[PDB]
Amino acid sequence: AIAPVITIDGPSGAGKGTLCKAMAEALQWHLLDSGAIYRVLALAALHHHVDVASEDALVPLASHLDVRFVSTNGNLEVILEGEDVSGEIRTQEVANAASQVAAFPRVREALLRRQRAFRELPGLIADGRDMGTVVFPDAPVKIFLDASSEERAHRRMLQLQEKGFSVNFERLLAEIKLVPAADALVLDSTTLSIEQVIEKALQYARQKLALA
């Protein structure tokens, strides 16, 4: 501890990514995207020819993972060993290798330690599913972002469109149809606009970490 950490947990498509980036840029703090972490490990393995099925080989790789996340104008750059790999990480191939890598207990443990090492001054914004419950249970500010099925389905639709696939909203609404920390601030992405969620998250963080 010592360096402040703001955790953002919630289901897929709730807007965590957007909130996380906006907060990291507003406060100019470090950023950690746990969801992308496994894909980056998987890509490093493929790049270095580390056997995706060998737990023993994957652990050292995970423990020394050279990754950093940078957000500019809401655009996320994933720098693995000096090069931006944001595009590579979005492929199904990497997504599949990420599932293989994530299956091993010792690999998940090593990645747990590696994620905790992102906590440095002036601060860290971290988003995922268990950031405030498992990774940083002592985080001074914890936020749980919830959203309606429609909001989540719409966000998913736009995310796929980007990869080139345009899919029926009704189909996705069906496709989509995680415990908040006891000390988390609960924010609903559907009662408030995303701009309002960011405002309210920043105000809460300020009352807890600064102001006066």
Binding positions for ATP: 10-18
Q: Would you state the torsion angle of the CA atoms of residues 104, 67, 98, 36, taken in this order, to the nearest 10 degrees?
A: 120
- Interrupted backbone of the chain, residues before each interruption (C–N > 2.5 Å): 177
Can you tell me whether residue 78 is helix, strand or coil?
Answer: strand
Which segments are annotated as binding site?
10-18
- Phi, psi for 192 (deg, rounded to 5): -115, 155
Identify which of 3, 55, 11 has the alpha carbon closest to the alpha carbon of residue 27.
Answer: 3
Alpha carbons 201 and 130: distance in angstroms, whole number: 18
Q: Name the region of 186 (left: φ>0; alpha: ψ -120 to 50; beta: rest).
A: beta
CB within 8 Å of 30: residues ≥ 6 apart: 24, 118, 120, 123, 124, 125
Alpha carbons 199 and 196: distance in angstroms, whole number: 5
Query: Is the separation of the CB atoms in 23 and 117 below 8 Å?
Result: no
